[PDB]
């Protein structure tokens, strides 16, 4: 047993590195996150130290699992995004404040996000 303080905080879930990794590239992360079969939204915000431009949103859906990174920060926007139903080419962390309650999902069946495991 160890001592603790009584202090509390009202902040969101995405306030530490708890859902952030950057050496589990799209080919590896789909092997570990793809044994799951939950709603379209069981995501992580990881990247690779291998793709020279990676900042991916990675969804776990109801038939497959896919990654959402292609371009770095631009001068005609911020972090770039272009999915057929998600042209989110601005800073995703600023949009997350709005998406928090009702997210944009993957190319969709369901739209709200929840947090998924990093390991197998």
């Amino acid at each position: 047993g160890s001592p603790a303080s009584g202090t509390s905080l009202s902040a969101a879930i995405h306030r530490t590195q708890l859902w952030f990794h950057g050496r589990i590239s799209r080919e590896e992360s789909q092997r570990l996150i793809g044994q799951q079969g939950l709603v379209d939204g069981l995501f992580l915000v990881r990247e690779s130290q291998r793709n020279p431009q990676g900042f991916v949103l990675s969804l776990c859906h109801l038939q497959k699992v896919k990654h959402y990174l292609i371009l770095p920060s631009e001068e005609e926007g911020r972090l770039y995004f272009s999915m057929d139903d998600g042209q989110t080419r601005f800073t995703d962390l600023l949009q997350l404040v709005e998406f928090h309650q009702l997210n944009r999902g993957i190319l969709p069946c369901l739209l709200r996000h929840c947090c998924t495991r990093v390991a197998l």
Binding site: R26, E27, E28, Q30, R31, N51, V56, K64, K66, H67, Y68, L69, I70, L71, Y80, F81, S82, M83, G86, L107
Partner: peptide
């Protein structure tokens, strides 16, 4: 493995 990304797969 496949598919890779979205905006594609890259």
């Amino acid at each position: 493995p496949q598919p890779e990304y979205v905006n594609q797969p890259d």
